[PDB]
Amino acid sequence: FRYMPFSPAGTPFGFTDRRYLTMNEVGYVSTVKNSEQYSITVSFFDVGRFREYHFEDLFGYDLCFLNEKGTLFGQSKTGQIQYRPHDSIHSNWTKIIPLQAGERITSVAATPVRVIVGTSLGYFRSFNQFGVPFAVEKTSPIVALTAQNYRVFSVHYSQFHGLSYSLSELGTSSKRYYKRECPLPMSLPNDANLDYYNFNPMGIKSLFFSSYGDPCIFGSDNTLLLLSKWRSPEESKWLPILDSNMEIWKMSGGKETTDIHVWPLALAYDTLNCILVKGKHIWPEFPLPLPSEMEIRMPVFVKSKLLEENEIQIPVSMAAEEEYLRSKVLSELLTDTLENDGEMYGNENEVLAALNGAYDKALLRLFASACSDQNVEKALSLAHELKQDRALTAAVKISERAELPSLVKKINNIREARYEQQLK
Amino acid sequence: FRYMPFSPAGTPFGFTDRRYLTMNEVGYVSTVKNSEQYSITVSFFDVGRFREYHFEDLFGYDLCFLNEKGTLFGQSKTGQIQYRPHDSIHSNWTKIIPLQAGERITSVAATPVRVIVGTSLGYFRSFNQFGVPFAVEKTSPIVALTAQNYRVFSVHYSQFHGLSYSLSELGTSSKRYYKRECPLPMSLPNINSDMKKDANLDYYNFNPMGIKSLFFSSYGDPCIFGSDNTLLLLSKWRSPEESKWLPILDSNMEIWKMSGGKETTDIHVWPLALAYDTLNCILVKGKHIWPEFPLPLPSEMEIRMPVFVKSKLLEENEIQIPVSMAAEEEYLRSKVLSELLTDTLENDGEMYGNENEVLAALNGAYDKALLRLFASACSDQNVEKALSLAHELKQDRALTAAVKISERAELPSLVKKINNIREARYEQQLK
């Protein structure tokens, strides 16, 4: 195995002399090669907030990470790093990380109060915002890093066992571990495609943290994985709430192309930000693409059934099952976030009220279909999943219209049982 | 690494066009292929309660799992599943699970309140008894499943990892984990170069992991039986950091003792059911290790701890074991069973209503077997070894019997040491 330098949302060179160093919601950092040196150009999307600047690269940095306060650079061959803050008040600092024979820096990370540097031999060296060292730790080799505030999330991959991930928090008292090298369910891969595989042996396109406190990962299998309930190890699980193949197929009309990929940028509570790249290569080049937004969809479909019923269109009855799965995951995560962290924007209550109303409404469409096919028993289990008290009243009217008097009395027993538990 | 569809106690075709889909304590499900389709006939051991029936298959359902309430069928290629209840109250239902290119259903499971469908990519899709879909969970690829009406037990394995075990329960509100992906050190099958022309090559091609059968016990303990012919039982499953695997049975020593010290390979053990003291099996005689059409009568085989020497048994001579040697094996067997039965009653309570008589008889035989080793230590004048054996006694009446063995062996210093243990236990009991 060869330890290649990894960067968040980076693209390889290909047949050109320029590429993207890093890419996130703040902006993008790229490099332009000239006759004797390298040239780093940093461009942002929000031109009105920060000042755009550029400088010549004499040392030849190949690693970069961008956060809301500065830019960190790192050299894998000589171990020389440099942190450049956007404000002129803070001064620049340069320090050389010691490296052994054959040791290369594979991934870097930066937070405004701590600096995280990972190597191929598993050396964990942590610095503060001024360069003062605190501790030297020996762990598994880190191949990927992402951070929002305090948290350190490292992906580990050894020579023999490999494929694991760790989750930690750099608190004021001591470093606390929530997960200790749990196995990663990401699928490994079994010319544009050939060149990308060598530079990126694991196929990790991009990785970032969500705005609501949950870690997200996007592997080579093009499935958006959502880590829910990370504060409790008893109920911590991965949730694939979005499937790439289903979203492209429904919007286009019922076909499936090859040259239209989905590169992830950010996720801010409703849609996944992306760049529509059209061409042979899977990596973008220089034009300025407009950012697009894709609506989140659960990957639950059949392929033979969609062709018989015919941009490909989905009917009413089939979409009620997908709407039930999507609303159930989002309502549970939003409830636990507000009861533990509170409000963040100030409009979470209107989102929660609209989501809970659509959840009970979508369940009634499946409830009406069960009564039409005379399945009284399947209709009984659907009534217990209702949350609001007004949804139970609406279930009685669907049952009386379908001429089922025994189903009507069963709804009333659920109502009396919830009122007794509420008074205890 | 290409996977294979796994079923509980499934047998391959071999040199025929017919095989068994699944096999358990309820009954057996077999299929007969006559040149165009499959004919699934489900037979049971209890002819009095249920009625034997059969039907014609037009989809080729190879994955099956049988429980006390119904029969589940699954298709690894198209993803079409079907559940058939035995009683006439509930009606049949058909649903097609969507599957991508490459992805196939490897193992299915069925409980009366939850439906478990596992895939080759590790997608965990769970359904209820009415068909309402739940949340989709992405985990490691599942290769083996077993359940007994309430919990989900998954075994994970890939090409860059190794065999593991997970224990979870599908509750009414959310999924709760007892054990989450802990490593399982079960040995893999070692296929050599001479196995390519052997007649048992067909069994390993349908099941590369070598998992012959796996099921839960009558008292709720997880069990697994791999290709290494050693029955492994999971002890202390209520504590995640204290969970241990304890081998209480081995077939490789029992065949040699019953055959009079021979070296034949025509005798095997196929596990069907285990209710705390006897593993039900079928004595298959022949070259093949898998059963075929008509099943012989079931025999009874009591569990024995695999602690023997091979050179010592030949010098002392069905092979017979003496009194003195069997006391060490009886002590190891009774110690494991008494600890598990005590923790089961203090946390789950009674299940049949006769657990107290089993516990009283087991504790009496435990103290009695320790006295045989205690008498042997006094005869060889080892006073110090006899002191450590006295501390392992549970009942107060066993301490009185140890005094009489010590006085007969003419050891007055050993007598007073037994009385100090008696005074120490009475002081702790009053606190």
Add this chain to the structure above:
Amino acid sequence: ISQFSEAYNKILRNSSSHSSCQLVIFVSCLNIDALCATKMLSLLFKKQLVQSQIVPIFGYSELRRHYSQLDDNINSLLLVGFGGVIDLEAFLEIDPQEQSFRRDIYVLDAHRPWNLDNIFGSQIIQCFDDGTVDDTLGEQKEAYYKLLELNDLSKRKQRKKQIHEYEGVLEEYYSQGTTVVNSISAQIYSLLSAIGETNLSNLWLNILGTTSLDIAYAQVYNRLYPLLQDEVKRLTPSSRNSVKTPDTLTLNIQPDYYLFLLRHSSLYDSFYYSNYVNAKLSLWNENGKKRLHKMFARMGIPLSTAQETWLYMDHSIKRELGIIFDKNLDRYGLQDIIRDGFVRTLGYRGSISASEFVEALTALLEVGNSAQKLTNLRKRWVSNFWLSWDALDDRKVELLNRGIQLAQDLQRAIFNTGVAILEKKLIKHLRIYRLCVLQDGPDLDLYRNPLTLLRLGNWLIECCAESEDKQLLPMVLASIDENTDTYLVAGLTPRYPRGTKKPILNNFSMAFQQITAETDAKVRIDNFESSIIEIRREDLSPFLEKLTLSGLL
């Protein structure tokens, strides 16, 4: 002392209101580089959404009548290159009023002699002092610093001599000739890069001004041969050609020549300014009007396919000159022709480089239109300035070629009389310089506006650019068109034939202070640039008698 990002944010908050909080900038029109620096500053002030007011000023005596009479609440005055030599705070009194003052100008002076008060002792004159000169007369830390505060009969007597020791180092200093060391293109473009705004129009704009100084000095832009190279590669728009895009303004590099405006047109009127290049060799007419006819009429120059042959398949002939002058390289060795240069295109509408482009801007600034005539002469040059500033859009196309066809007659006009004053033989090397007085010829009207005069000297400094291994001194000319003998006399610089080792800036402005200090008998320095003054007819003859003895070089 002024970090470049700091003054921008500081001048931002001082006038950013939606009222008459008007900041106003001033610019001279007498310089091409003075224009192009200001144009890029205005447009970023548009997209930073501030109100403004732009006024040109052509005359140095005019500055009082344009500022010191009309002010209400202007807090932020801005100015481009006016007061490196004369102190404006002595020229204009500003009393200290309201240490954290009430109205603060900046300055963007580009010249070599500075003024010590304007950097040290700064209270309203916030000058541009960043990493421009790190050695801003580094010996000054005790001269004026002890001039500010100035038994003791033997002690103070020594202390007066130390002041007199400080007096000489302030006497040799403030007695130097002037140039521009660094163009104003260099400063503000570096400032915007500290802010970081990526537009190739800027990169097209900043290179224009430094291209203008290619005919006034040599090694100033020779330092900028890397800084042209890195930016066009760091601001690489594309790796492919990505053809048939009418937009996107692609930037490349291609070789080019002293023989100029070729890609626009006229290999015909190249024949004149090929003989300009042979005027750089050893002649002006004689051998060349034979010698040109080995290298030129080899192809008769057509009418219709000459839109194609000296546009396109002259690339077979530019190659052919490229394979002619490679064998004129180890043998001729005249390296005034092959040059690296720079070019741009518009997607369509022809390829236009920046060599010829500065040429159109000079001529279009020229033509394109008691004491009662000078007012109606001064209102012209401001007005015709104005139609050149809007030349930097795509919206001017059919006015762009207007200067082009204007330029290729003005040289034919200026060469028509240069050949006359040679053959008259009225250049006289008296002792130091050479003096020429164009008393009267034809077409005297094109010598009022001084921008033609430096070009006439630029042609005339090169007639004497032979070996001349003694007396490398430029000339002083004379001409008159209007009443009372105004006589816009001027001086030139000596030139080097691409071998500056000696420090040759100017000696005349030192003498120009002398004659102006003598009698004040109708002498004028009201024109802006110190290299041009005026004289009376009966004063030019005692002018030179004061100059043939006052050897100040």
